[PDB]
Design a protein around this ligand. Sequence first.
Ligand SMILES: C[S@@+](CC[C@H](N)C(=O)[O-])C[C@H]1O[C@@H](n2cnc3c(N)ncnc32)[C@H](O)[C@@H]1O
Ligand SMILES: C[S@@+](CC[C@H](N)C(=O)[O-])C[C@H]1O[C@@H](n2cnc3c(N)ncnc32)[C@H](O)[C@@H]1O
Ligand SMILES: [Zn+2]
Ligand SMILES: [Zn+2]
Ligand SMILES: [Zn+2]
Ligand SMILES: [Zn+2]
Ligand SMILES: [Zn+2]
Ligand SMILES: [Zn+2]
Ligand SMILES: [Zn+2]
Ligand SMILES: [Zn+2]
Lengths: 273, 267, 8, 9
Amino acid sequence: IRTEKIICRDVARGYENVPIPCVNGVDGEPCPEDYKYISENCETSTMNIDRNITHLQHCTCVDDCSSSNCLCGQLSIRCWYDKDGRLLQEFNKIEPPLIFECNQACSCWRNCKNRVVQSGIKVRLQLYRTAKMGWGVRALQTIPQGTFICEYVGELISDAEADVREDDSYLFDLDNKDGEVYCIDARYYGNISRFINHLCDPNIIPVRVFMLHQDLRFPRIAFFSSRDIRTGEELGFDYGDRFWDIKSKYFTCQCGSEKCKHSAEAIALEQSR
Amino acid sequence: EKIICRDVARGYENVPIPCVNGVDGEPCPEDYKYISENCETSTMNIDRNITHLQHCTCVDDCSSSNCLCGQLSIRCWYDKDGRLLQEFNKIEPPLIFECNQACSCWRNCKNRVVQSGIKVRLQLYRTAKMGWGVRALQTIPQGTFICEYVGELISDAEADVREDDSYLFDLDEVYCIDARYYGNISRFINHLCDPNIIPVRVFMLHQDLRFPRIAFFSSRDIRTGEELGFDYGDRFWDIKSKYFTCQCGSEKCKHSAEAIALEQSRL
Amino acid sequence: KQTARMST
Amino acid sequence: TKQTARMST
Ligand SMILES: C[S@@+](CC[C@H](N)C(=O)[O-])C[C@H]1O[C@@H](n2cnc3c(N)ncnc32)[C@H](O)[C@@H]1O
Ligand SMILES: C[S@@+](CC[C@H](N)C(=O)[O-])C[C@H]1O[C@@H](n2cnc3c(N)ncnc32)[C@H](O)[C@@H]1O
Ligand SMILES: [Zn+2]
Ligand SMILES: [Zn+2]
Ligand SMILES: [Zn+2]
Ligand SMILES: [Zn+2]
Ligand SMILES: [Zn+2]
Ligand SMILES: [Zn+2]
Ligand SMILES: [Zn+2]
Ligand SMILES: [Zn+2]
């Protein structure tokens, strides 16, 4: 019987609100150190993100920003966060809206109701060794539906640069369209989200969010729970077909769900009819 | 006397900064936007390329002389509690390079004082003669980080045409911080010819030498209730003495109407 | 595209 | 010198 070992007390080296430990109860693989943990997105060439403070849409609220008069809320039709910072039950989990959180130009206070993602990680997460999918991340607590989990953080690169990257296991496209579009690559520089696996039955969803800037080329990718999550469950999202159409030649899905769309069996069956 | 704002920073700092006025009827100043970090109003293109960061490889708490980040200022000038060493040069301070997101060390290393923000209890208050001022609500030992001079980053050329030149802090083709329209608590710190704080240029998340960040530290032990203040310097007074003179009231005062009148008697 | 991309 | 007043280190 192999023991579960604690192999890193905090993969974030103190950068997150909470520690993110790393365990292994499966094999001999030591803590992964082929990348640089960063808590906030980085740049390795000039992106000219629009940071002009006078370009910010901002509210005039003197409330805690819970009224329908918050211009920030209005920018996503309404504010989708409840009094505890969770997405409302009616949130569109299929086609999420863009969220505009409050910013430095708003008249409101730092602890207003429209600042969830910018306040960082609050749930307890763990990096662990899975049986078949290398490293994954699991929850150390119950997580109610709509709760902010973590951001997909990494190195901002152009679409053309993403097209020439040797490792394509950590590329997240910020926009699905043509033209001047950007990507987060978490291969070399990333946060805990770089270890989140694909599940054909996902329990978290990615949502585009604006905080300190509103450059629409550079939304930030926030993961929220899409259902109540039980203690110990692996976290996972649907990576999508722009991933699997390429990756399925190299490996197939090991999520093990009855709903799996990307296993060897699901693929071979589709090939047949 | 009266407590008139529980937190001028509206929760942006680590601690609240209250405002009081026991002098006169002036209401809490609101003709500016409180920001906790420097803002941009034009294309500045601060170099944030992570691969341009000099960074250390320390696996300890960066308390050793081998820390590369420390060596960039000849040594780290912070003691074990986050205070400037007694021997730190208070007249011509060095450039301080804090540890950063490219370093191998942890977030709590010993070379990260300024980036961890305000820790001392401060108060915005009404002075007798110099408008609004900032004072200490606790004792502050020598070398303690107080606050950063935060505001709007502008060019030299923009800084030369600004109508109000009461809040401009030169960074060093020099850039400036203007705290007139956007700033933090430091905008309210007055000039003292007998100063108790000093400004130090500091790098943290980037090392773009055009944009040092301005950190105030205590140049001596400070008692509860003492007004904080620094020496604004001659780039300030040479221009401003034409419009007003120093009210600090020190016997060492170099910028009062009297001191200037006595110096004109240079014959 | 030439490389795999996660996407919403 | 300069047109406007400037605090400095
Ligand atoms: C973003 S990484 C996830 C963390 C990764 N498992 C690790 O050990 O670093 C994505 C890569 O993990 C593996 N992976 C993720 N989901 C998978 C799945 N559902 N089945 C098989 N492999 C998966 C693949 O190698 C994929 O290219
Ligand atoms: C950076 S501001 C400081 C805050 C200012 N007292 C206020 O009420 O906003 C600089 C201005 O404060 C006033 N001031 C600061 N120190 C002074 C001094 N030692 N003597 C006279 N006026 C002073 C002058 O109007 C100066 O232009
Ligand atoms: Zn609002
Ligand atoms: Zn708000
Ligand atoms: Zn707002
Ligand atoms: Zn699957
Ligand atoms: Zn170091
Ligand atoms: Zn360090
Ligand atoms: Zn360092
Ligand atoms: Zn004086």
